[PDB]
Design a protein around this ligand. Structure first.
Ligand code: 2MP
Ligand code: 2MP
Ligand code: ZN
Ligand code: ZN
Lengths: 194, 194
């Protein structure tokens, strides 16, 4: 439903050699190509520095998709507004999202969201070049959620992966909530600065 | 155009959150998101380190798409083979290509090709993050042509931008030819090494 609706805002304009999602120009990019960039970045700047670059890239994508969802706001509930995010992420072929428990009220600054991630392109791309890892590896995907939800709520909303396919788990699972409700929220917020 | 022929190799499966072009998984990525990453890489590693990283990412994309083109060899001419490169580059929303002159024989190792680039995503976004540039800026786009053509020929075909919108130019213009037919071809080839 949310997919069908938002999918109509994705258009291919070959006569411009361009692709548009709402107001934003998009490119189709091979995950292998992004994966080899990630490898170079990790290999030369280190896992931590690379994680941040990607999280902030994901952050701007999410902010942009939130602007797009903001225009499509009429008739939609707060949850329906939130749902567009997972939907765009899915349309963009990034990940398949299933909302598990979602508590939102934008007026009241209420947000607590848990989501299932399946077929995370990031997790199964890190795998093909690093194998399994200690910490969660879907950095760009997390930044997108963070970006999208913070833009929607008009306040800092951070996300963490509780489990991730690149750690060896069967799925990625994420939790989003306001900066105040994270035990190390200040360290988390830092990663989103250049 | 044969954009039609290749269009059938692009399959969107939203009900799964994935996009495949031939046998490569793809994502739709906001050019503004790539722009932000590009900005951080320049500021942190310099113009030339970054240019290298993008050329190499583009190179990987090109090599993968030439693999797709090869499965569609059918009863195509060498030029018709060559032509799927520009077609894929246009399907992926990167740029629209116009051949000026194309001289190719894969068997004999001959290649000399000049093209127009219109509506370059990469030139357009570089200007938005840095302004007009001193030298051509469609790094990822050049690497793709290089990678695609080199993989198709089984020999190193390097491309250079003679003109670029990122420079104040009303369009981009490129020249591709074998390594040995460039005077500086050994220092150009260096950028394709991590
Ligand atoms: C809000 C949002 C957007 C995209 C996702 O993958 C997940 C979430 C939670
Ligand atoms: C070969 C090839 C591939 C992609 C382009 O944009 C241009 C050329 C010439
Ligand atoms: Zn993950
Ligand atoms: Zn250019």
């Amino acid at each position: 439903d949310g997919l069908s609706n938002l999918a109509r805002r994705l258009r291919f304009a070959m006569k411009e050699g361009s692709i548009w999602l709402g107001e934003q120009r998009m490119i189709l990019l091979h995950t292998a190509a992004l994966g080899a960039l990630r490898k170079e970045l990790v290999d030369t700047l280190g896992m931590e520095r690379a994680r941040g670059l990607f999280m902030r890239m994901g952050f701007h994508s999410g902010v942009r998709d939130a602007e797009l969802a903001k225009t499509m706001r009429s008739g939609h509930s707060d949850f329906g507004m939130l749902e567009m995010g997972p939907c765009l992420h899915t349309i963009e072929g990034v990940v398949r999202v299933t909302p598990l428990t979602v508590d939102i009220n934008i007026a009241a600054g209420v947000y607590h969201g848990e989501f299932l991630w399946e077929d995370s392109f990031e997790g199964d791309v890190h795998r093909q070049m690093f194998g399994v890892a200690q910490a969660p590896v879907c950095w760009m995907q997390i930044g997108y959620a963070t970006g999208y939800t913070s833009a929607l709520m008009g306040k800092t909303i951070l996300y963490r992966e509780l489990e991730c396919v690149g750690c060896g788990h069967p799925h990625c699972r994420i939790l989003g909530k306001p900066l105040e409700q994270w035990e190390d929220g200040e360290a988390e917020l830092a990663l989103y600065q250049p």
